[PDB]
Design a protein around this ligand. Structure first.
Ligand SMILES: N=C(N)c1ccc(/C=N/OCC(=O)O)cc1
Ligand SMILES: [Ca+2]
Length: 223
């Protein structure tokens, strides 16, 4: 997260870290057994880490649970990042508490102009490279689809939306991938892609979760 703020320990209780010997992506806990992340975060041997603040220090509230399966969206296209969503099932159910909690799926899509909360342990520099210890947060508005398409001509599908600041300076970044975009207490986006981070006229592009609720519910009902 570039240009954001320190969230505060366990204030984003649905935020997860995906670990394969190191943190590589974020995710969102949607119930005791399932995490929503980005399909481009797929790899084998994922361990889900819940209740994290400092990802490099065991502070006492963590739950580390191995993934039993990963399900990439059937229409995920890794070239265009269309349908950039994946479900990860935990080997055992998480214990839900104040520090580890699920985030609601939306019943309707979010509105242009709505301020959303984006979070992660990704790069905090728009140019160089610096990774934070503690979870970082950013409040950013959903942009109009016409501004989004103008920013990224020929690349924005109906399964994507832009959020952020066209002036640059504030954005999600590498290492935030797969993490939550929460708007009005619902999981509306997944950190997906963008040209660099926090660049002028290049806002963040996010998977449009409201399009996938049917697939999510069907998949979790059968796996
Ligand atoms: N909002 C952005 N500008 C943005 C968001 C996500 C990415 C994802 N990069 O994938 C590589 C990785 O996370 O390791 C890039 C730019
Ligand atoms: Ca920790």
């Amino acid at each position: 997260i570039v240009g954001g703020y320190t969230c505060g320990a366990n204030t984003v209780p649905y935020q997860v870290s995906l670990n394969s010997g190191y943190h590589f992506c974020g995710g969102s806990l949607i119930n005791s057994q399932w995490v929503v992340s980005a399909a481009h975060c797929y790899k084998s041997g994922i361990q889900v880490r819940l209740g994290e603040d400092n990802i490099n220090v065991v502070e006492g509230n963590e739950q580390f649970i191995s993934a039993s399966k990963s399900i990439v969206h059937p229409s995920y296209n890794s070239n265009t990042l269309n349908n950039d969503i994946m479900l990860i099932k935990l080997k055992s159910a998480a214990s839900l508490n104040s520090r580890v909690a699920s985030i609601s799926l939306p019943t309707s899509c979010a509105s242009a102009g709505t301020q959303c909360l984006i979070s992660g342990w990704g790069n905090t520099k728009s140019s160089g490279t610096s990774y934070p210890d503690v979870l970082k947060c950013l409040k950013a508005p959903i942009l109009s689809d016409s501004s989004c398409k103008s920013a990224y001509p020929g690349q924005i599908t109906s399964n994507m939306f832009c959020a952020g600041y066209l002036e640059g300076g504030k954005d999600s970044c590498q290492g935030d991938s797969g993490g939550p975009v929460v708007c009005s207490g619902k999981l509306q986006g997944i950190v997906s892609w963008g040209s660099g981070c926090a660049q002028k006229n290049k806002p963040g592009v996010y998977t449009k979760v409201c399009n996938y609720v049917s697939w999510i519910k069907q998949t979790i009902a059968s796996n």
